[PDB]
Design an enzyme around this catalytic site. Structure first.
Site, PDB file in Angstrom:
ATOM      1  N   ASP A 126      92.491  -5.137  19.036  1.00  0.00           N
ATOM      2  CA  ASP A 126      93.069  -5.606  20.279  1.00  0.00           C
ATOM      3  C   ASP A 126      92.629  -7.062  20.458  1.00  0.00           C
ATOM      4  OD1 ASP A 126      93.488  -6.321  22.993  1.00  0.00           O
ATOM      5  OD2 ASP A 126      92.669  -4.446  23.772  1.00  0.00           O
ATOM      6  N   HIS A 179      92.535 -10.053  22.916  1.00  0.00           N
ATOM      7  CA  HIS A 179      92.681 -10.350  24.349  1.00  0.00           C
ATOM      8  C   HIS A 179      93.581 -11.564  24.570  1.00  0.00           C
ATOM      9  CE1 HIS A 179      89.096  -8.043  26.361  1.00  0.00           C
ATOM     10  NE2 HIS A 179      89.913  -7.247  25.695  1.00  0.00           N
ATOM     11  N   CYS A 218      87.904  -3.746  18.190  1.00  0.00           N
ATOM     12  CA  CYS A 218      88.577  -2.519  17.803  1.00  0.00           C
ATOM     13  C   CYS A 218      89.072  -1.813  19.054  1.00  0.00           C
ATOM     14  CB  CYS A 218      87.677  -1.599  16.989  1.00  0.00           C
ATOM     15  SG  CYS A 218      88.605  -0.212  16.290  1.00  0.00           S
ATOM     16  N   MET A 262      82.214  -3.677  16.842  1.00  0.00           N
ATOM     17  CA  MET A 262      83.515  -4.201  16.474  1.00  0.00           C
ATOM     18  C   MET A 262      84.129  -5.153  17.484  1.00  0.00           C
ATOM     19  SD  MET A 262      85.273  -1.729  13.987  1.00  0.00           S
ATOM     20  CE  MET A 262      85.426  -3.239  13.051  1.00  0.00           C
ATOM     21  N   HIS A 271      71.859 -18.361  29.721  1.00  0.00           N
ATOM     22  CA  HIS A 271      71.055 -19.473  30.220  1.00  0.00           C
ATOM     23  C   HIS A 271      70.367 -20.138  29.036  1.00  0.00           C
ATOM     24  CE1 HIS A 271      68.087 -21.466  33.014  1.00  0.00           C
ATOM     25  NE2 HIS A 271      67.389 -21.450  31.892  1.00  0.00           N
ATOM     26  N   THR A 288      72.729 -21.032  35.141  1.00  0.00           N
ATOM     27  CA  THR A 288      73.079 -19.763  34.504  1.00  0.00           C
ATOM     28  C   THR A 288      74.544 -19.419  34.735  1.00  0.00           C
ATOM     29  OG1 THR A 288      70.813 -19.034  34.888  1.00  0.00           O
ATOM     30  CG2 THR A 288      72.406 -17.371  34.204  1.00  0.00           C
TER      31      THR A 288
END
Ligand SMILES: O=N[O-]
Ligand SMILES: O=N[O-]
Ligand SMILES: O=N[O-]
Ligand SMILES: [Cu+2]
Ligand SMILES: [Cu+2]
Ligand SMILES: [Cu+2]
Ligand SMILES: [Cu+2]
Ligand SMILES: [Cu+2]
Ligand SMILES: [Cu+2]
Lengths: 335, 335, 335
Positions: free
Chosen positions: C91, C93, C129, C143, C248, C273
């Site tokens: 997959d 994104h 995955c 993965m 950070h 941060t």
């Protein structure tokens, strides 16, 4: 002054639908009148028959979404039937003063009260039941929903350009704390007050037994999946009254996302995953560009696929080989 | 060049107050001098008498909040009394190089050291203890605070408009990891070192036993509540050195909020709840419009009301009926 | 039209390195061709000999970073050797449609497939995955990786000013859920399949046993530390496919930080941060101004120093006393 503006009444619809509403409106400041009735009830929350001693607005998790426009006034009648055990009240995150309304809405079973507040600020806002400084319980048992206060002028991108959705959907994510017996199976309670001590104890562990979208594991899948079609633009409203979550649309994106859910700020674009802070509601706009069955979930995938925070969107339309194409289907590896 | 510049001396106040300072200033770069003394001590952290073998800057949680302006130099003399057991040092997240000062401030008990750094970036920055080996522990046992580096011209909205607060408050939220006996009650240790092994074990579970504002449950409630009045504008500085949190003001908002706590970036408006990342400090401005008793909390309500991440603000003034009106009080339901 | 564009092949490199690439480019859209081979393997994940039954893209955690430009097409051949015992998919994104490519990349051991997608959006994107709606075992087992889609013009500050890095490094933070025995010691599994049931059970608790960068505790330290020098500007790509983290850099900052990791959005400056949401990949830019050893870490310090989420950068060059100087070294407290 407010006692003299035109009073209107809105019929509320149960989730994942949002009551019909105008985005950008010609109209002027109104007082919008709503009615919600608290319903305490035992609900079945997963596929193996586990039950929650729940506390809902209008008998659903989440409560229904209330839509108004900046500068409108919200006027709510909160109803606590005599058939309920507990007091309730409501804190509108969109309201200003007296604990968001909670001090002015303490209704005992068999009572009702009416609160009005100015919706002076735009965005999605959580409303939820209130504790007098007390161990939540009411909230986590189901008492929350969203108030959406749209800008009078419609939704605007960072450059000021207008944005329109064809349809809005509402998702409430509830982290549930169902107790377990010594046998290791979940406990089933006859009454609400029976469930209290055991639940409080699970809550301290900060570890939900389930985390569900709209009241139930798989509540937004199969026969109840969300629907849209290629070319359509959806607004996904995501509320989480008590805990952080990280929404994501699988093989989708957030075209324009207000993860803090406050419309006056410039939305962010192209997001894979966004973040709803515990005790807030955000919104995301997506225009579908591919058909098929999408999943919409909390992208802590344990929380999603092991604990329950996931649903589906079924999408009608024409497959677009440019955006994505299967060059070679799964086949054996060259000898 | 640094030594040339005027050396001034600030005397710090204990939280929740911030030492008197100028927002927008006509002054030029100074070297501001501070002294903090590390106090190791046992502290009572809740209402049922539970104790923490704490480590602190100036005998409080959090340490006091150091305020300077962009371009000032921070000069800290750090004292580690001969009466303490452990070595200490300091890491300013606001400073640049050598682990934020830590590598140059390694004071054993009965030693002191002086560190200078340029405060070249503006915002609220966490400072915390950071020895070799055992950093979280010193940190979770209470050794963090906030350095606020104000931009020289005061605080600016996204348009460049000037922003001004009347009083500022510092809240440090501390996630505490107090061990338990085999009998289920909290352990009470004679010395700091005896607490170590047991505490680390609780730490690995990533589940706080308590989460407190400024050193104990209800530290900012009743007599010790923060105070304000309608028309006043407050800056709420919120620091969390180790763990995420999500501040909210009940029946309030963040009018302007730097949740990442860095002032060069544009704030956000109308936030219901914001998010302080673990190991950061953020800031929010709010101008009161209603009197009454507000609650300031971590909006994971389990963490708020059950573990102790909550405080109150008592607000003087006159009720504004436009913003919110109890139309009809809790009466019985009509037939 | 895609098939009529130039097709180029990229050789992938193991993390923390990112394969050689151009930031700003004059080149037109291309089809960038990649190959990844899935490898299931047992790995040592800590200093005390604990093992993980891992699954990986290219035999590493994370998988290698794939770089392309906004407008390019990614063309991956996913190879699942007959030596593996599990099916896999991927997959992206950064892809639009069909669960991010998952629905068209389902390869049983001994199969392979080839997927093309248009990198129409710019940023760092997770690929992992795909668990087609099931407990995310393959994900937590290793993965995932990043796809970086650089804008064709280079990276841009909020004002449109051009930003450039000398080297880019990729850190994948993995939250592991290794089971324990009745004896309290971590389990060791003969085969991968034998590790399943017990792991899923740990996962349900949402408490990682370890949280490692790049595949083991201290993987980015000692001989394996990241390297830079004063005046050098680095891009720090941080991915977390399943759980929130808060990166950070100690005595360092994020000069410009896309914490949501989407480049078409204004970055933020001066961050102490930042916050990578679980299921996302963020990027940060820093220009070293001081030499010495730096630590790059999750600023939940328990997660950093006890669970394993920390690494080091070794920085060459010359100390700069204006930024920070040790006024008095640690020495006895005076009378
Ligand atoms: O994109 N969720 O695997
Ligand atoms: O009840 N917290 O707004
Ligand atoms: O700045 N981390 O100690
Ligand atoms: Cu209630
Ligand atoms: Cu609330
Ligand atoms: Cu210390
Ligand atoms: Cu730090
Ligand atoms: Cu796989
Ligand atoms: Cu994903």
């Amino acid at each position: 002054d407010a006692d003299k503006l035109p009073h209107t009444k809105v019929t509320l619809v149960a989730p994942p639908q949002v009551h019909p509403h105008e985005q950008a409106t010609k109209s002027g400041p109104k007082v919008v009148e709503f009615t919600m009735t608290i319903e305490e009830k035992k609900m079945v929350i997963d596929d193996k028959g586990t039950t929650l001693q729940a506390m809902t607005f209008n008998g659903s998790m989440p409560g229904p979404t209330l839509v108004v426009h900046e500068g409108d006034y919200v006027q709510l009648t909160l109803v606590n039937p005599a058939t309920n055990a507990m007091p309730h009240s409501v804190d509108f995150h969109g309201a200003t003063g007296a604990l968001g309304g909670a001090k002015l809405t303490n209704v005992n079973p068999g009572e009702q009260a009416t609160l009005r507040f100015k919706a002076d600020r735009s965005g999605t806002f959580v409303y939820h039941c209130a504790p007098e400084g007390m161990v939540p319980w009411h909230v986590v048992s189901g008492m929350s929903g969203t108030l959406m206060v749209l800008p009078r002028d419609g939704l605007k991108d960072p450059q000021g350009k207008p944005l329109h959705y064809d349809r809005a959907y509402t998702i409430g994510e509830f982290d549930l704390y169902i107790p377990k017996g010594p046998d290791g199976k979940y406990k089933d309670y006859a009454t609400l007050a029976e469930s209290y001590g055991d639940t409080v104890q699970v809550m301290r562990t900060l570890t939900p037994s389930h985390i569900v979208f709209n009241g139930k594991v798989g509540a937004l899948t199969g026969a109840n999946a969300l629907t849209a079609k290629v070319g359509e633009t959806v607004l996904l409203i995501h509320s989480q009254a008590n805990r952080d979550t990280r929404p994501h649309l699988i093989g989708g994106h957030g075209d324009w996302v207000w993860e803090t859910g406050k419309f006056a700020n410039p939305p962010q674009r192209d997001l894979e995953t966004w973040f709803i802070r515990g005790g807030s509601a955000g919104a995301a706009l997506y225009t579908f560009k591919q058909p098929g069955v999408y999943a919409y979930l909390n992208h802590n995938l344990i929380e999603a696929f092991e604990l329950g925070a996931a649903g589906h969107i079924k999408v009608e339309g024409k497959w677009n080989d440019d955006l994505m194409k299967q060059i070679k289907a799964p086949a054996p590896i060259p000898r």
